[PDB]
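notes to self, project folder thing:

trying the whole complex as one job this time. last attempt i did each chain seperately and stitching them together was a nightmare. three parts in total, labels are on each line so i dont mix them up again. if this works i'll redo the older ones the same way
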Amino acid sequence: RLKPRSIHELSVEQQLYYKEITEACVGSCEAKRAEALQSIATDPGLYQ
Amino acid sequence: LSNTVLPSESMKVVAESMGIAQIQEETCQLLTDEVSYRIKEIAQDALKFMHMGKRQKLTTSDIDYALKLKNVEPLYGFHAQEFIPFRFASGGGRELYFYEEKEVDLSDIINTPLPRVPLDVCLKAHWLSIEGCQPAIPENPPPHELSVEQQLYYKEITEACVGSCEAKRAEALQSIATDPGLYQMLPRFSTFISEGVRVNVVQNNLALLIYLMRMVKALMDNPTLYLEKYVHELIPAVMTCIVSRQLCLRPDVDNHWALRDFAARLVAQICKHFSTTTNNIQSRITKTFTKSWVDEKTPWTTRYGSIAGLAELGHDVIKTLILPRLQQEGERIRSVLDGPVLSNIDRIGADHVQSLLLKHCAPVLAKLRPPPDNQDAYRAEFGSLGPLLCSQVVKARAQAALQ
Amino acid sequence: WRYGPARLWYDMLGVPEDDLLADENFLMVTQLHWEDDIIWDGEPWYSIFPIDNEDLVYGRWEDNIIWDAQAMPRLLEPPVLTLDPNDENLIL
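result (full assembly):
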């Protein structure tokens, strides 16, 4: 008996979004930071 | 159930061997209830020679002794060694069975090999029972899968922690704690531990539970293996060792109390190393301990386990869980300083609960009060917790002097 | 499974078939000495993050705690080995 291969609780769009927002929030470019900061400030689905 | 007779169509066949062309069905019924009546009177009189001459076989000499009894002429030729053969004939519409008798040349019966001569009846004596059971003389009846290496390692390590000796147990626990490749045997150890803690309900063995908790404590100290995937099995086993009520076989003398604080220290370690905000291990452990403690009807053993785990979690937990219900100490001292039944088992558990409570609430009282503490004990419940707090402040001063 | 892991226990048994409960109290800001963490003078096609134990994260393992041995609210059953393959360090 093998338990089923589980899936991460984030989608790959959500995981890609997390990667883009974190790589923008380390501030290589300032306009990228500022949008990523506004995206953090008003994304409704940023829970989970 | 019913009177069974020979069939009426078996008498039409017999009547045509005679030459009777047409026989009506009321005559055939008249024939077959008579011949099946005379069969049952020789079936039951052959059985009287089978029973009186003790045989239980009904040989064909029993029927011949009964036909001799009913005056009817004997049936010749039924003592030879034969059987029941029948030969089917299909035919063009006439279905029947016959004998198909065979022949033999006469000189092959004059020159047959003769059988061996019979023996005469003699007597033989032997003991059947000698003042008891039968003798044994011959005249009586006779009366994914683990490889063999790690399968052997699993067998030796699990049987070393069952309690034959202490030194093999210490070397087995020092093996579990300090080997690099024990993965692929972690699910077997988790199953063994959880089922063994479950088997405490059939046999309340304190010693084997202490051995399984030292097995868990040895599994936690292994740097190489990660217990994150198997912690959901080890958490309720240690929880069962904490908050169950009968941990003992003899409740009064067995120190279930230590398997309590040992497993409480174990679960504080298991929710220090593994609690993540996705896990919610510590919040879900505090909630079980809290609703087991605040709820009345709980025995003093399980309340001791709840207070022990909550007080091993840390200082802020005993600030925000233990300290609101300090008035419960009065409900405890209701049954300690003044009990109608003194010789029951509630008193030792109650003052164990009391000693643990004031030992753990003495540094909490030392953290959130004045340095004087003149009548804090009087302000405290029962005036004892306050004496313990004064002792704790003295101990803290001694520690500062040592520093 | 009688012959599986825990066979030793099965053989020993001889069985042969085959307001303080408010949610805030439990939030770990109010239950953790997080002051110790403050550092003073110190000195995605496949998952990027790891996948957590679904049984620990989701299951009610609290239902395997035996609160009273004699008065057990439900009847527990023998557990079969499930060999989760999500865990690495296991060949299969």
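what i see at first glance: The first helix of chain B runs from residue 9 to 18.
need to look closer tmrw
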